[PDB]
Design a protein around this ligand. Structure first.
Ligand code: VFE
Ligand code: VFE
Ligand code: VFE
Ligand code: NA
Ligand code: NA
Ligand code: NA
Lengths: 264, 264, 264
């Protein structure tokens, strides 16, 4: 803490401010700027030309590419320099020009990214976002403020997710989409505004979901989208299904967090 | 002029060419490049890794973030190094990777941005554009050449405005739009190609327009879009309305500048 | 080879690794990074803040702007550091934040860009892409992996081309498009997903195609899109037409490479 490990490498052209913590076998490349409240974990690499600032904690074995901006002042017009936070986990691939901004006081104070994510060129994570584990944001994918992207979700290229929206686990959002409402777990969404196109079967298969689990999830999707019933009508029905198929509880948990209605 | 104020701060790693003017309490951060024909006003901050060049005048209390390119050679295939210009006013927040390019001789020689604007990540202002005051360009918003964005207008994320188009004052263009024709003042536009969706009532309310003014503006919108008359038929009618409600004159002034027809 | 020409200029702040080849009257600007397996041809300019790495060959009289990343590790999840390649030809204008990534072993090992191209701000050329000569990628235009863009083709702003797709010569793809299938030569495409809108007549006229050639190309387009016949039905017919009008052979050559079907 507030120490640069003797096995970390800091390029002579880099500027790491006194107070920064840099772990064993980390690598700060040329022309990087690292502020005094940053913590960079073991084995993390900033290739070159990376700016990291604010109250920002980055885990182990991350790879952050040139022209990325991590921890920076957010774009919220109300933000006025309060000491809000960014947390990033482990083994993320954070590509050229990615931006990850600090929270706002009003939004909870924290922008959080988990582990094993791929954030492709110019992906944007606004203030107060929460990204889980094993997600993909393709090139130019943009999360406006207060967005949640749950585990394994893919946000396609050139896609915007509007403020406060929740993207459930194992979702796939097609490229060139505008997501203006909440996307239930396990769903394929595409378009502007994005609408649902069935369950992400190929994803669930690849990720080892059982036959029974995928059938149950398709049954939950049909309750929401095909039954023609109200969401409040089908909530008990989905809970009843989840009593046998635990993967269906993700719908229940998602309904509790959803504030924008569902894409339809 | 051609002087660096004794109260300006220039990082030792920055490269400011002889001839540049830098005002009192300006701050040029690490790895910035500032060319010889640049003028930077009092209190302006280039955070780090900013390139400013060409015949470029930047006002007071701007905040320009890393990886921005301001004044650079434009993308017009006819441009051949002529000494065209950029002018930027005061109190702008110009975020990471924004690009603002110099004019072309054929297009009038000047790209101009006013004051109190927010240009979000990777917004683009092409050659010969004119942006007013208190505008917002959201992430990846792109103005192709010779575009005007009038005061208070918001261009949503991932939106392109095609060359020569005029966006009137207090417009809101939705995210993921393609604007291929002119947008009258006070209008909501969305889609690809963008089409009108009524007056920006919430914006006008927030910005202190009177009840009478907003009703008059809605009446002007109905003349254009609902009356089913020709634009040339309803111009006198809108001028007549403006004789009582001065805010309606913005329509008249806009018609005189519009060359691409109106979105419909 | 492995030599810096005595007439090349390397800024003192640049970092060019031992083994890099830099030709006569090349210019490496401030804060550039050039790796040991890079070759930069005569007269090429890296303005500032450019990263060039990997097994990468860049020709003569290129202009590469700040915050570009050329030769970098690609975004393919299977790629694991294999010594794949980028080749770039001559007289390209490669604008701010452009990304051009190295190949994958599985995709053929090479990303290739020809000559006299304009790659506008934040254009992206993924692993295993092939871009010809005199192409334009407008701002934020994105080629996903294994895409071909043939000579004179224009990819509009904010447009994504999905993996493996082929864009034929003299195509124009409109801004804000998603191209999910193959685009025949000489065709205008727009939308999400992009659909065809006739032949690019204005382009062909500007580029000196004969009257007879343009009529023949329109006749080939009608066979594909208007005749209501199968593609396999009209292939002989298009070959027969090409026996008189050589420009129609581009259709034949294109059919042989197309794997995703045609946009329709
Ligand atoms: C109809 N098909 C689509 O929409 C495909 N797709 C969604 C998508 C995206 C990525 C994945 N990955 C799976 N493993 C790793 N990545 C899967 C699905 C797009 O985003 C296309 S555009 C694009 C695509 C890639 C890069 C840049 C751009 Cl611009
Ligand atoms: C249907 N609603 C929309 O389209 C919302 N919107 C327009 C818009 C945009 C901004 C404002 N601001 C108002 N005060 C400050 N900013 C208002 C309306 C988008 O651009 C969404 S996408 C996006 C949004 C924000 C950042 C990045 C991205 Cl990508
Ligand atoms: C319906 N018309 C369109 O879609 C126009 N267009 C296609 C296009 C694009 C470029 C050319 N060039 C021809 N010589 C040089 N460039 C021609 C056609 C767009 O890409 C518009 S958006 C945009 C446009 C330009 C820059 C940034 C953005 Cl974002
Ligand atoms: Na809820
Ligand atoms: Na006019
Ligand atoms: Na084929």
């Amino acid at each position: 803490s507030h120490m640069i490990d003797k096995s970390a490498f800091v390029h002579p052209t880099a500027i790491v401010e006194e107070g920064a913590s840099i772990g064993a076998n980390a690598h700060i490349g040329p022309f990087c700027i690292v502020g005094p409240h940053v913590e960079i974990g073991e084995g993390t690499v900033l290739k070159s030309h990376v700016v990291v600032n604010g109250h920002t904690k980055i885990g182990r074995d991350n790879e952050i590419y040139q022209f990325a901006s991590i921890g920076e002042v957010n774009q919220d017009l109300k933000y006025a320099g309060e000491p809000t936070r960014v947390e990033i986990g482990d083994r993320n691939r954070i590509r050229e020009s990615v931006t990850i901004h600090r929270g706002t006081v009003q939004g909870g104070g924290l922008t959080k990214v988990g582990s094993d994510n791929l954030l492709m060129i110019n992906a944007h994570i606004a203030h107060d976002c929460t990204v889980g584990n094993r997600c993909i944001l393709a090139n130019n994918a943009t999360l406006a403020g207060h967005v949640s992207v749950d585990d394994f979700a893919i946000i396609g290229g050139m896609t915007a997710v509007h403020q406060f929206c929740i993207i459930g686990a194992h979702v796939m959002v097609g490229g060139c989409s505008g997501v203006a409402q909440d996307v239930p777990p396990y769903v394929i969404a595409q378009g502007n505004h994005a609408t649902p196109f069935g369950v992400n079967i190929e994803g669930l298969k690849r990720r080892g979901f059982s036959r029974e689990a995928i059938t149950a999830i398709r049954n939950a999707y049909k309750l929401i989208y095909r039954s023609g019933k109200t969401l409040d009508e089908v909530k008990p029905e989905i809970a009843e299904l989840a009593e046998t198929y635990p993967e269906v509880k993700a719908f229940t948990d998602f309904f509790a967090r959803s504030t924008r209605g569902l894409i339809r």
